[PDB]
Amino acid sequence: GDFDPNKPVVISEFSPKEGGLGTRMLLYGENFGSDISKIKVTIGGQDSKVVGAKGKSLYCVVPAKAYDGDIKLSILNDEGEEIANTEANEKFVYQKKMLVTTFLGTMYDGNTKYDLKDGPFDDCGGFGGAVWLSFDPKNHNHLYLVGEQHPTRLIDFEKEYVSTVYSGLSKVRTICWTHEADSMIITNDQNNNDRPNNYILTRESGFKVITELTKGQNCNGAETHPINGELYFNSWNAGQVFRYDFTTQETTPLFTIQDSGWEFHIQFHPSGNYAYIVVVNQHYILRSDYDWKTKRLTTPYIVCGQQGAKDWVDGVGKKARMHAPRQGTFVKNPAYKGSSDEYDFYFCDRENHCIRILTPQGRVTTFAGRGSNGTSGYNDGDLRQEARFNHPEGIVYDEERECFFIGDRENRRIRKIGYEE
Amino acid sequence: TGDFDPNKPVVISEFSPKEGGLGTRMLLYGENFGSDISKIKVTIGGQDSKVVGAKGKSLYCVVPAKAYDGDIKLSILNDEGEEIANTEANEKFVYQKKMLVTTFLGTMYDGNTKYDLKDGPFDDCGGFGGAVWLSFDPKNHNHLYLVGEQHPTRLIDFEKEYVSTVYSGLSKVRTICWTHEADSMIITNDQNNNDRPNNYILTRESGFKVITELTKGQNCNGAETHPINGELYFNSWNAGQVFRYDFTTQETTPLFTIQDSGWEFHIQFHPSGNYAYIVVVNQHYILRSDYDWKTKRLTTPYIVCGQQGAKDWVDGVGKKARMHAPRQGTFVKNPAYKGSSDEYDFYFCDRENHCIRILTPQGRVTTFAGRGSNGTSGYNDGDLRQEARFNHPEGIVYDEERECFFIGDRENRRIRKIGYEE
Ligand SMILES: [Cl-]
Ligand SMILES: [Cl-]
């Protein structure tokens, strides 16, 4: 069918009635012509690419942001001017999905270069490192990050500004908070047993006065109990767990995990009933139940992965495989409402370039990454089909903003995972 | 064999199922339980668990309410009920909480035949004459208002745990709605004189106690404001006419007729304000009226569910579903609809079916609660579908902060609650 300029253009029906981004829509009607270049379809105020035209029908692809679902069609001349227009009587029903996007940071010269600077959200350069992410418990607009040899920085959502908190520490691994949040605990990984492993930054000083809390070699992270407030940290040498009491300033060695050279961090469940022990250099996770009577973590047991087996394998418990797991985050799952454990554990699998999910029952799945048929890279979009990370390290779930923030190391950016906006 | 031996140990070897909740029939395996049910005491999560069978090497018990910890203890007793042997299971039972119907407020006396109409604390406020429409104060989530037809407009104050009377005297109060700024409460009166008021305004400045007439009109079955643009929509039963009132110009515009004469209905807007449900109380069906954002008006309605004039109790899609005297509804955010155009379900009272129904955005009607205990009307708390009963439920509100439903259960003179086990 050829377009007739002296005849009206009409939409009789469209299908499917429902869908979202990338849905292949079929539009029935009259006098569309068969030249794709002279047809303009707008869905929800957004341009929709026409992929087929047969005079009485046309195919188009539902674009991103087409939320209103209002369908407009125009027939154009060679110069792109509208010569006929029509509108559908019914609106298309748009279902939003989750996407990986770039929240903060940028690189320039075809993503080969980046600048280390303070500045607004739109002009703050690139992040040297974001290995651990933590919100201020007293201010949900303040998101802190540590970057190993790179500075400790602040992402302020209220002012839309990125600033430097503290510079100079050789290898900052974690951030945790005292029960009253009057202090920030910064953990430094260094080989001298007479030099500090844990530092404190006080709130009253604007986190400018730094204090040595404990001394110790090769500490890969520290974490406070969310109810009783005591600090747990390690030493890589024998893979020993230490308990520090803030009131008595006493350190107690607890158990050893397994063998020498055990690089791990401890992450408590929000109830404080247990912690996951994430062994970064041995590619497996353990669970350590909390003894409320002794106010101590107890002998842990393997929950998933296999000690020393680097791979990407989804499955239950010991059948699962990972490669360099980093920070995790406890996420409230509405499907678990009423159960003993209402949370899933989402974590960065750094050398698998993806985000994994560990359920309370020990099942490991992949949430995001490894899209576009590869592993490492820099790609936004569909969580499993398109999205790619390059050594994701830090991660935090934002319950108020209903999204994830990820420290994507080689891409020098803070990535976001949330529903399209 | 199968008899308890006082000189041998009592132990638990295993139990099944490993998971369940309230009323789960558990099977315990072990040694030396005996076969006398009266001398066996099982405790699950610190709560007494009734033993229903005992065969020496096995027993049956029922998981009680509040057994959340799942720790299992067993004791063998003597004739006087004292513990003579004690054991414990190595594993904890995994308890999954469920929703229950409970009585939140109000009471009746003399075998639920009489009730007192009085102001008082939550524990001693008598019974409710009526709670046909429930509405939270948008500026104070501790203040829950109710209207009761011929009975007074009352306040349920969660902060003070007190029930008070706000206004008395109106013949048939149907609905409550609020001005966009919530400086005023709109109270709708159903009366036959066209020269007498249908809509009253209660100022916040007076604690919602001083009244003023807003509009005049006969047989109005309810009014509702647009949640974004703030204009008022109300009806007239006579021709089933919808009217639009603009607060700034004080101009009433007749909009559209639903169908035929004697159409008793209320209008309830979706939280987005993109559409409203038109609930036809005396014709047992619901319509949807899309909002035209350009003209700032509701438009020509279309049937969403139920069959005009066909009274019944039938779960189903669209016109295959049946109801009998639907009353107030409440929009509840469903986490399963995250990202979709409509994220809410519509829960409503089906007065003469004595239950709570759910209308999904796709037009499916199901039953949420009521009609338990092999009956329809009654007064029973517990399991939503197996035990719970209502008697002419009318008002309903979902409390997002307290994560529960509050229901105006007319003949039971109580405010019922639907929430998870606590
Ligand atoms: Cl892929
Ligand atoms: Cl039943």
Full DSSP string of B88-140: E-SS--EE---EEEEEEE---BTTTTB--B--EETTS-B--S---EEEEETTE
Pairing between β-strand A18-19 and β-strand A93-94 as defined by DSSP bridges: parallel
Number of domains comprising chain A: 2
Distances (CA, A) of B204 to A314, B139, B168, B173: 59, 10, 17, 19
3-state secondary structure chain A: CCCCCCCCCEEEEEECCEECCCCEEEEEEECCCCCHHHEEEEECCEEECEEEECCCEEEEECCCCCCCCCEEEEEECCCCCEEEEEECCCCCEECCCEEEEEEECCCECCCCECCECCEECCCCECCCCCCEEEEECCEEEEEEEEEECEEEEEEECCCCEEEEEECCCCCEEEEEECCCCCEEEEEECCCCCCCEEEEEEECCCCCCCEEEEEECCCCCCEEECCCCCCEEEEECCCCEEEEEECCCCEEEEEEECCCCCCCEEEEECCCCCEEEEEECCCCEEEEEEEECCCCEECCCEEEEECCCCECCECEEHHHCEECCEEEEEEEECHHHCCCCCCEEEEEEEHHHCEEEEECCCCEEEEEEECCCCCCECCECEECCCCCEECCEEEEEEECCCCEEEEEEHHHCEEEEEEECC
Chain B hits for A93, CB-CB cut-off 8 Å, are 340-341
Q: How far is B118 from chain A (nearest CA, A)?
A: 37
Pairing between β-strand A343-349 and β-strand A392-398 as defined by DSSP bridges: unpaired
- Cβ-contact B393, B355 below 8 angstroms: yes
Tell me the C-alpha distance between B350 and B279, whole Å. 11
At residue B39, φ and ψ (nearest 5 deg) are -105, 15
User: Residues A26, A151: one domain?
Assistant: no
Chain A hits for B421, CB-CB cut-off 8 Å, are 338
Q: How far is A93 from chain B (nearest CA, A)?
A: 7
At residue B308, φ and ψ (nearest 5 deg) are -45, 120
**Total residue length of chain B:** 422
Chain B nearest-CA residue for A94: B341
Cα A374 to ligand 1 centre (Å): 6
Question: Measuring CA to CA, which residue among B416, B374, B364, B410 is closest to residue B391?
Answer: B410
Pairing between β-strand B173-178 and β-strand B184-189 as defined by DSSP bridges: antiparallel
Residues facing residue A203 across a β-bridge: none
Q: How far is B341 from chain A (nearest CA, A)?
A: 6
Full DSSP string of B248-260: TTTEEEEEEE-SS
Minimum-distance CB partner of B97 among A338, A419, A420: A338
- Ligand minimally distant from the alpha carbon of residue B389: 2
Tell me the C-alpha distance between A120 and A135, whole Å. 19
At residue B277, φ and ψ (nearest 5 deg) are -90, 135
Mutation choice for A interface testing from B91, B288, B338 by most A CBs within 10 A: B338
User: Residues A227, A288: one domain?
Assistant: yes
In the DSSP assignment, the letter for residue B45 is T
At residue B319, φ and ψ (nearest 5 deg) are -70, -10
Cα A382 to ligand 1 centre (Å): 10
Chain A hits for B338, CB-CB cut-off 8 Å, are 419
Question: Measuring CA to CA, which residue among A408, A351, A352 is closest to residue A380?
Answer: A408
- Cβ of A95 within 8 Å of Cβ of B341? The answer is yes
- Cβ of A338 within 8 Å of Cβ of B94? The answer is no
Element (DSSP H or E) covering residue B212: strand B211-216
- Cβ of A339 within 8 Å of Cβ of B96? The answer is yes
Tell me the C-alpha distance between A122 and A142, whole Å. 17
Chain A nearest-CA residue for B338: A96
- Cβ of A419 within 8 Å of Cβ of B338? The answer is yes
Tell me the C-alpha distance between A155 and B325, whole Å. 55
User: Residues B387, B332: one domain?
Assistant: yes
- Ligand minimally distant from the alpha carbon of residue B375: 2
Report the 10 Å Cβ neighbour count for B159: 9
- Cβ of B96 within 8 Å of Cβ of A337? The answer is no
User: Residues B90, B112: one domain?
Assistant: no
Domain ends where: B98, B133, B166? B98
Alpha carbon A46 to its chain's center: 28
Q: How far is A267 from chain B (nearest CA, A)?
A: 23
- Ligand minimally distant from the alpha carbon of residue B388: 2
Tell me the C-alpha distance between B104 and A173, whole Å. 51
Chain A hits for B94, CB-CB cut-off 8 Å, are 339-340
Provide the token pair at A155. Answer: 């992402």
User: What method was applied to determine this entry?
Assistant: X-ray
At residue A386, φ and ψ (nearest 5 deg) are -120, -45
Tell me the C-alpha distance between B16 and B93, whole Å. 9
Domain ends where: A66, A81, A97? A97
Cα A139 to ligand 1 centre (Å): 38
- Cβ of A97 within 8 Å of Cβ of B338? The answer is no
User: Residues B74, B127: one domain?
Assistant: no
Cα B371 to ligand 2 centre (Å): 6
Size of interface A-B (CB pairs under 8 A): 30
User: Residues A174, A284: one domain?
Assistant: yes
Tell me whether the omega of the peptide bond preceding residue B393 falls within 30 degrees of 0, making it cis: no
Report the 10 Å Cβ neighbour count for B74: 24
For residue B84, the one-letter residue type is I
- Cβ-contact A232, A223 below 8 angstroms: yes
In the DSSP assignment, the letter for residue B386 is T
Tell me the C-alpha distance between B267 and B234, whole Å. 7
- Cβ of B339 within 8 Å of Cβ of A96? The answer is yes
User: Residues B92, B106: one domain?
Assistant: no
CA dihedral A42, A44, A45, A51 (to 10 degrees): -20
At residue B359, φ and ψ (nearest 5 deg) are -110, 110
Pairing between β-strand B316-317 and β-strand B302-306 as defined by DSSP bridges: unpaired
User: Residues A73, A215: one domain?
Assistant: no
User: Residues A324, A375: one domain?
Assistant: yes
- Ligand minimally distant from the alpha carbon of residue A388: 1
At residue A317, φ and ψ (nearest 5 deg) are 50, -120
Question: Measuring CA to CA, which residue among A60, A65, A61, A71 is closest to residue A96?
Answer: A65
CATH of the domain at A12: 2.60.40.10
At residue B412, φ and ψ (nearest 5 deg) are -90, -10
Tell me the C-alpha distance between B31 and A394, whole Å. 52
For residue B177, the one-letter residue type is C
Tell me the C-alpha distance between B334 and B355, whole Å. 20
User: Residues A122, A158: one domain?
Assistant: yes
Q: How far is B350 from chain A (nearest CA, A)?
A: 27
Secondary structure (3-state) at B204: helix
- Ligand minimally distant from the alpha carbon of residue B385: 2
- Cβ-contact B330, B396 below 8 angstroms: yes
Distances (CA, A) of B119 to B147, B158, B185, B192: 15, 14, 21, 31
CATH of the domain at B132: 2.120.10.30
Residues facing residue B349 across a β-bridge: B356
Chain B nearest-CA residue for A338: B97
Chain A hits for B96, CB-CB cut-off 8 Å, are 338-339
Domain containing residue A248: 99-421
Chain A hits for B336, CB-CB cut-off 8 Å, are 334
Residues 6+ apart with CB under 8 A from B110: none
Q: How far is A133 from chain B (nearest CA, A)?
A: 26
Distances (CA, A) of A154 to A104, A127, A178, B99, B146: 12, 11, 18, 43, 48
Pairing between β-strand A264-268 and β-strand B151-157 as defined by DSSP bridges: unpaired
User: Residues A202, A173: one domain?
Assistant: yes
Backbone Cα Rg of chain A:
26
Element (DSSP H or E) covering residue B162: strand B162-167
- Cβ of A93 within 8 Å of Cβ of B341? The answer is yes
Domain ends where: A97, A114, A131? A97
Residues 6+ apart with CB under 8 A from B379: B112, B389, B390, B391, B409, B412, B414
Question: Measuring CA to CA, which residue among A358, A357, A348 is closest to residue A396?
Answer: A348
Chain A nearest-CA residue for B68: A340
Q: How far is B89 from chain A (nearest CA, A)?
A: 18
- Cβ of A97 within 8 Å of Cβ of B339? The answer is yes
Residues facing residue A253 across a β-bridge: A242
At residue B414, φ and ψ (nearest 5 deg) are -135, 160
Chain B hits for A97, CB-CB cut-off 8 Å, are 339
For residue A98, the one-letter residue type is M
Chain B hits for A341, CB-CB cut-off 8 Å, are none
User: Residues B89, B127: one domain?
Assistant: no
Tell me the C-alpha distance between B70 and B58, whole Å. 19
Provide the token pair at B375. Answer: 């009956």
Residues facing residue A134 across a β-bridge: A144
- Cβ-contact A181, A203 below 8 angstroms: yes
